[PDB]
Amino acid sequence: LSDGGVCCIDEFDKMSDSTRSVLHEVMEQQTISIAKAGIITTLNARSSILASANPIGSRYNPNLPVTENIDLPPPLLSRFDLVYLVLDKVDEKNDRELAKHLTNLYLEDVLPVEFLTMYISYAKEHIHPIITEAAKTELVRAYVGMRKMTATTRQLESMIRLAEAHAKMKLKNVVELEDVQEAVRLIRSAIKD
Amino acid sequence: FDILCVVRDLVDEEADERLATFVVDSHVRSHPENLNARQRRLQRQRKKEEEISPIPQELLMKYIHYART
Amino acid sequence: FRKISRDRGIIDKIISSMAPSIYGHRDIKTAVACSLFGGVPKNVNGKHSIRGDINVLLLGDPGTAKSQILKYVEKTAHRAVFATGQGASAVGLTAS
Amino acid sequence: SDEINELKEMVKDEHIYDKLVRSIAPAVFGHEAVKKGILLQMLGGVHKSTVEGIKLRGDINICVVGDPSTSKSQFLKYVVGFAPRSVYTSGKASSAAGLTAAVVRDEEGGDYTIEAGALMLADNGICCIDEFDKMDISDQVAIHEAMEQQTISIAKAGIHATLNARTSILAAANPVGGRYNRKLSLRGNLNMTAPIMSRFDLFFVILDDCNEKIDTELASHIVDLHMKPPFSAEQLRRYIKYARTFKPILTKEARSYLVEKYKELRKDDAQGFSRSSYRITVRQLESMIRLSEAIARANCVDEITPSFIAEAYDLLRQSIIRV
Numbered sequence: 032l033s034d035g036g037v038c039c040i041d042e043f044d045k046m047s048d049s050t051r052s053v054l055h056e057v058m059e060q061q062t063i064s065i066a067k068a069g070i071i072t073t074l075n076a077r078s079s080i081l082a083s084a085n086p087i088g089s090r091y092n093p094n095l096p097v098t099e100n101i102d103l104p105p106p107l108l109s110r111f112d113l114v115y116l117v118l119d120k121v122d123e124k125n126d127r128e129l130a131k132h133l134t135n136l137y138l139e140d141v142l143p144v145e146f147l148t149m150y151i152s153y154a155k156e157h158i159h160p161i162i163t164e165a166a167k168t169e170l171v172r173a174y175v176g177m178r179k180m181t182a183t184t185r186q187l188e189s190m191i192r193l194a195e196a197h198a199k200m201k202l203k204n205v206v207e208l209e210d211v212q213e214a215v216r217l218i219r220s221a222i223k224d
Numbered sequence: 225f226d227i228l229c230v231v232r233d234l235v236d237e238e239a240d241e242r243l244a245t246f247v248v249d250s251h252v253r254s255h256p257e258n259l260n261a262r263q264r265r266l267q268r269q270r271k272k273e274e275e276i277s278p279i280p281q282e283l284l285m286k287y288i289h290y291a292r293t
Numbered sequence: 294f295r296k297i298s299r300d301r302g303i304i305d306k307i308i309s310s311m312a313p314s315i316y317g318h319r320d321i322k323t324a325v326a327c328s329l330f331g332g333v334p335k336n337v338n339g340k341h342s343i344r345g346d347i348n349v350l351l352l353g354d355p356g357t358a359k360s361q362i363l364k365y366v367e368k369t370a371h372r373a374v375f376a377t378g379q380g381a382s383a384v385g386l387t388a389s
Numbered sequence: 390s391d392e393i394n395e396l397k398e399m400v401k402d403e404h405i406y407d408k409l410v411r412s413i414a415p416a417v418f419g420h421e422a423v424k425k426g427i428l429l430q431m432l433g434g435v436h437k438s439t440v441e442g443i444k445l446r447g448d449i450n451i452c453v454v455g456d457p458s459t460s461k462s463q464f465l466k467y468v469v470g471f472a473p474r475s476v477y478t479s480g481k482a483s484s485a486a487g488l489t490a491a492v493v494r495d496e497e498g499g500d501y502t503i504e505a506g507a508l509m510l511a512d513n514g515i516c517c518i519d520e521f522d523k524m525d526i527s528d529q530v531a532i533h534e535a536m537e538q539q540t541i542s543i544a545k546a547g548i549h550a551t552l553n554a555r556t557s558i559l560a561a562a563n564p565v566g567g568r569y570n571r572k573l574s575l576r577g578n579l580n581m582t583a584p585i586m587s588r589f590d591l592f593f594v595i596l597d598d599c600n601e602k603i604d605t606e607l608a609s610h611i612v613d614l615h616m617k618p619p620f621s622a623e624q625l626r627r628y629i630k631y632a633r634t635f636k637p638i639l640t641k642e643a644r645s646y647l648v649e650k651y652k653e654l655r656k657d658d659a660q661g662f663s664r665s666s667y668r669i670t671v672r673q674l675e676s677m678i679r680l681s682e683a684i685a686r687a688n689c690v691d692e693i694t695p696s697f698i699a700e701a702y703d704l705l706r707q708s709i710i711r712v
């Protein structure tokens with residue numbers, strides 16, 4: 032039902048390997064290759080999954096990498112483009128500024144979502160970036176870098192899709208080096224594991 | 225099941241060579257391309273069956289049915 | 294049939310003829326011959342009926358012609374039917 | 390007449406055999422051995438009937454083993470996009486019924502009927518299964534008949550049948566735990582067991598490991614495919630359709646050579662003080678025949694040279710020599 036839109040899934044770390052095995056062909060083929068009694072179909076479902084997941088148990092262990100914490104296997108994490116840690120660790124500076132940020136909500140009488148979703152929609156209708164050689168060179172180089180950091184072409188394909196997504200900003204409609212650099216850089220924040 | 229047959233795939237060189245030769249010979253003897261024209265190829269087919277079978281299968285089926293009934 | 298049967302070698306000529314393009318496996322071919330001819334069913338005074346049929350199990354390794362032996366018998370027997378594994382059900386096997 | 394000229398140029402170009410393999414799976418870089426096997430599967434061996442009525446299988450069954458990041462699923466989607474009479478399903482999210490055939494009530498007549506599963510739709514065709522190792526054993530033991538006896542035999546609900554399942558199976562498999570380990574046998578790398586592994590003709594083990602020149606070339610190909618082969622699909626399919634009209638015969642010099650090369654595989658497979666077999670059953674001798682027939686079709690020759698036996702012998706060694 033989320034064909035052509037974001038599928039948000041919470042509690043994702045607790046999901047059984049069978050259901051993940053179905054999501055494999057979503058992330059690989061964006062369609063479901065059913066075959067049951069009377070029903071055979073390749074059911075197209077082009078959803079950008081936004082999973083929300085946890086370390087096993089009550090807390091993340093900072094002395095361990097994200098794979099050892101999340102307990103989902105590494106190649107499942109390699110399906111996703113970006114993987115993030117958001118952690119509750121005590122810091123009076125961050126906790127003061129977050130508490131201020133939250134408590135400011137009760138004071139006041141592009142922010143609004145109506146313009147954001149309009150802008151995203153118009154970008155989807157109008158902006159379809161082609162790739163320039165200044166992007167190609169960094170794509171090939173950066174993948175070969177993290178491959179001998181130990182990586183797969185799924186990271187390279189992720190970099191391509193992210194660079195194209197980055198190239199939809201400013202109605203740019205052309206991918207260049209900076210798009211690849213930010214796609215690669217945000218992946219360097221993730222692939223460290 | 226008041227007879228049991230136990231069947232094992234042991235590697236055994238002189239058994240495997242005779243088996244493999246037989247299987248290859250059987251494959252070519254079963255290949256598609258291999259007193260009129262119809263009867264003539266049936267006669268060749270009969271001799272091909274006699275290459276391995278002491279009695280014809282067509283005879284054996286009627287012999288089975290007779291012996292049973 | 295009468296003529297060929299009185300050959301003192303007829304049993305082994307039959308058993309060799311069983312599944313002829315299957316090499317060796319002479320104990321299987323013997324058991325298949327025995328099953329396919331069967332025993333004699335009996336009933337003592339009408340009180341005690343006795344099975345005449347002979348049941349045979351081929352237990353063994355992959356790629357040893359067991360399925361092909363069954364497919365041979367399917368062509369060779371007068372009344373027969375062939376069923377495989379999860380293709381069967383209890384009622385589909387006995388009656389429904 | 391111009392299509393006839395294409396076929397004439399194809400048989401005239403006597404090193405066509407290499408061009409065919411490079412025309413397989415054009416979206417996928419490298420993996421020449423898999424591409425060769427896929428060609429031989431689509432060409433198939435020759436179906437045969439024996440004097441006792443016993444059929445001997447023509448179809449070639451292949452399994453492609455590798456890491457989930459690999460090009461494996463793109464091989465399946467190539468064959469599904471290219472080959473006539475071909476079907477696609479996943480090992481999980483499918484059932485033994487939807488695989489061989491189901492038994493259901495007819496909405497019109499009200500009584501029971503057979504309901505065709507994928508291995509019937511792929512009859513005289515190809516069946517492509519993704520995530521095959523992640524299929525239930527309930528369903529892996531279901532396809533055993535279709536892979537070898539090439540039928541689906543059913544006895545359910547008072548309806549009895551033996552439906553044809555003359556399909557070449559192509560299975561995408563992951564090793565145990567997802568990551569391959571060549572320190573173990575192919576026995577240990579898979580959750581499969583000898584009944585199903587012996588039913589496959591040959592295994593391609595496309596593990597992925599780093600190599601900077603290969604990796605730069607692969608990355609360049611991937612990026613060039615995002616737009617930063619020897620034949621068109623029509624030409625390739627026309628050749629395959631023509632090649633499928635040949636019915637190659639084993640030359641007598643190839644027969645004894647085949648017996649000995651089988652005996653070499655048979656010797657090298659043996660396990661334990663018992664000398665028990667594991668991978669080389671009699672099915673693998675027949676696999677050498679089917680592969681040599683498929684090669685003779687790939688070369689458009691109605692006779693099998695001993696070289697074709699050597700190529701089949703080498704293609705079967707791929708799944709064994711990684712001890």
Ligand SMILES: Nc1ncnc2c1ncn2[C@@H]1O[C@H](COP(=O)(O)OP(=O)(O)NP(=O)(O)O)[C@@H](O)[C@H]1O
Binds near residue numbers: 315318354671
């Ligand atoms: N002794 C033999 N002679 C001829 N063909 C043989 C022989 N042993 C095996 N084969 C071949 O092996 C192939 C598979 O035979 P099959 O009947 O499936 O054996 P099986 O023991 O039933 N294997 P399985 O289904 O895994 O239990 C057939 O195509 C046969 O031609």
Ligand SMILES: [Mg+2]
Binds near residue numbers: 360
């Ligand atoms: Mg069997």
